[PDB]
DNA sequence: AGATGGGGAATCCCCTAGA
DNA sequence: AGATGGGGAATCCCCTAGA
């Protein structure tokens, strides 16, 4: 028995919420576009087993993984934890309502400590994600009654040492399903799976990529026009503005359009002067395609039509 | 003898700071745009009496006065209090790097009381911002020491029913001149002044009105062109752009762009229509000025060219 | 010296609106 | 019901740079 994903949940887009921003916000949602769909992220529990219990916990997207600060907040949670369980007709068990409680920096520590301190009494992959020397506690711990001195001090060592590298703008969700054991009691799980990175859309560099409106929707094959783009909040110093065409056979062409940090007004518009197409002496006019670029991690925004004219 | 102003402080432009944005910033600034001039703002004790004591305070710029939360940090500063003395040789005294100290909203109470206190244990126009009743502490109160139980209860329900009202974005100054009385002690003084209001340039309804670039500096005299204005920041239901020639007679024209809150983009961008000129059939062309208006104070930008062509 | 700004991030608040 | 966004304000952080 294996458990698996069968959607990630949507990457970009969702936005983590402070405590005081309340409950009422809405859920993360799964990465199908497809039309009339609410789609929300899945995972599936392959090679049946008896009515399973599958958790999800937000961890680190760091190079080694670890337990995130932040809490998953919503429908099916306590704790920072999601629990649901995967009934004998439905191996698959999908999250609705799961919102991204989003911690403060002056209080990650003791947050991210308290969150350890839970799964090591849970025995939520405390081995995993805390220490690898509290990997006995396992399925075990004891609510407060059976955490002792021990796993205590090493529960601060590892908090203390995890909160300064701490990114508090993605987090991953790790799955792990607890098939049962004993008469009733579910206790020992599969390994956990770990999802895609889920970065906030509210931070400056996972923000979401949109041409609003621009000045100019046509301009000379030869370029050097100036256009007025006015957009969604971006950072001067990581944006382009891409022009491309695709050709059928999988070819691309792509020019950028030119302008300095400084052209970049207030992170709300973007004055540009238009690339050189590729051919110069054409009859007919091109259709192209404009779009906003992140140089970072090169994601975009939906393209915007863009026609060229001859000299 | 009697206080007077010689050079208000500037009203809108300067920035109070909080806490933590430390101390390093700047000095409020004085009314005059002269060149090569820093200008501070003025006060001048007129009909010359003894080596004078003045002191500035922050004050309300409600209907009735009432001593603000926020405090003057600077170079003659203790306690949000200013304090100066005016030299025989030199009656007039300016004020050179007050910064105003920005208290938040959730700790305006305890901070209105505390400066409450000191004025009144300092005798610096306690009947006037506190209460009427403690009128006699002018010029007395003993610090610690001798404010009693009594004053004590009556600087909790002045602070408790002011913090409420209170306007963290604008405050005025108010200058108190204190002449010698015994040998040495200055302890009477004129009447006190209150100077205009300095509203917090960070505040978004004093916003500096700035127009950074325009998309056309010039349209068709009939009005209709689409123009893209990039702007400081401002708020779409109270922002006009205001389009306006001035002849030489004092009569002036004027016709405002049209566009929808919803044409302000996020604030710092702007697309409207141009407005029709003031006379259609002409031959040669007309240079009229373009700048933002805030509807509510009527604060203006600096003028910005541009050339109506006719039909 | 000693006088001096500003952009934008991190956090948080409150809108609008259909059965 | 019960599922659901977003704009921008209030606060705060850290840049650049000349003797």
Same mark, same amino acid.
């Given at each position: 028995?294996?458990?698996?994903?069968?959607?990630?949940?949507?990457?970009?887009?969702? @936005?983590?919420?402070?405590?005081?921003?309340?409950?009422? *916000?809405?859920?993360?949602?799964?990465?199908?576009?497809?039309?009339?769909?609410?789609?929300?992220?899945?995972?599936?529990?392959?090679?049946?087993?008896?009515?399973?219990?599958? #958790?999800?916990?937000?961890?680190?997207?760091?190079?080694?993984?670890?337990? *995130?600060? *932040?809490?998953?907040?919503?429908? *099916?949670?306590?704790?920072?934890?999601?629990?649901?369980?995967?009934?004998?007709?439905?191996?698959?068990?999908?999250?609705?309502?799961?919102? #991204?409680?989003?911690?403060?920096?002056?209080?990650?520590?003791?947050?991210?400590?308290?969150?350890?301190?839970?799964?090591?009494? @849970?025995?939520?992959? $405390?081995?995993?994600? +805390?220490?690898?020397?509290?990997?006995?506690?396992?399925?075990?711990?004891?609510?407060?009654?059976?955490?002792?001195?021990?796993?205590?001090?090493?529960?601060?060592?590892?908090?203390?040492?995890?909160?300064?590298?701490?990114?508090?703008?993605?987090? @991953?969700?790790?799955?792990?399903?607890?098939?049962?054991?004993?008469?009733?009691?579910?206790?020992?799980?599969?390994?956990?799976?770990?999802?895609?990175?889920?970065?906030?859309?509210?931070?400056?560099?996972?923000?979401?990529?949109?041409?609003?409106?621009?000045?100019?929707?046509?301009?000379?094959?030869?370029?050097?026009? &100036?256009?007025?783009?006015?957009?969604?909040?971006?950072?001067?110093?990581?944006?382009?503005?891409?022009?491309?065409?695709?050709? &059928?056979?999988?070819? +691309?062409?792509?020019?950028?359009?030119?302008?300095? $940090?400084?052209?970049?007004? @207030?992170?709300?518009?973007?004055?540009?002067?238009?690339?050189?197409?590729?051919?110069?002496?054409?009859?007919?006019?091109?259709?192209?395609?404009?779009?906003?670029?992140?140089?970072?991690?090169? &994601?975009?925004? &939906?393209?915007?039509?863009?026609?060229?004219?001859?000299?």
């Amino acid at each position: 028995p294996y458990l698996q994903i069968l959607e990630q949940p949507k990457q970009r887009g969702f @936005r983590f919420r402070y405590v005081a921003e309340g409950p009422s *916000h809405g859920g993360l949602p799964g990465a199908s576009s497809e039309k009339n769909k609410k789609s929300y992220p899945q995972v599936k529990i392959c090679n049946y087993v008896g009515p399973a219990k599958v #958790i999800v916990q937000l961890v680190t997207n760091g190079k080694n993984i670890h337990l *995130h600060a *932040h809490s998953l907040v919503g429908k *099916h949670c306590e704790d920072g934890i999601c629990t649901v369980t995967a009934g004998p007709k439905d191996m698959v068990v999908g999250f609705a309502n799961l919102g #991204i409680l989003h911690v403060t920096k002056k209080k990650v520590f003791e947050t991210l400590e308290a969150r350890m301190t839970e799964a090591c009494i @849970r025995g939520y992959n $405390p081995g995993l994600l +805390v220490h690898p020397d509290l990997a006995y506690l396992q399925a075990e711990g004891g609510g407060d009654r059976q955490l002792g001195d021990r796993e205590k001090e090493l529960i601060r060592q590892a908090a203390l040492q995890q909160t300064k590298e701490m990114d508090l703008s993605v987090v @991953r969700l790790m799955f792990t399903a607890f098939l049962p054991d004993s008469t009733g009691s579910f206790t020992r799980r599969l390994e956990p799976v770990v999802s895609d990175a889920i970065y906030d859309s509210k931070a400056p560099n996972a923000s979401n990529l949109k041409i609003v409106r621009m000045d100019r929707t046509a301009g000379c094959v030869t370029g050097g026009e &100036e256009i007025y783009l006015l957009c969604d909040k971006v950072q001067k110093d990581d944006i382009q503005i891409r022009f491309y065409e695709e050709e &059928e056979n999988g070819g +691309v062409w792509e020019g950028f359009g030119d302008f300095s $940090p400084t052209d970049v007004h @207030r992170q709300f518009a973007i004055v540009f002067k238009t690339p050189k197409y590729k051919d110069i002496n054409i009859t007919k006019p091109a259709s192209v395609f404009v779009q906003l670029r992140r140089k970072s991690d090169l &994601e975009t925004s &939906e393209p915007k039509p863009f026609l060229y004219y001859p000299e």
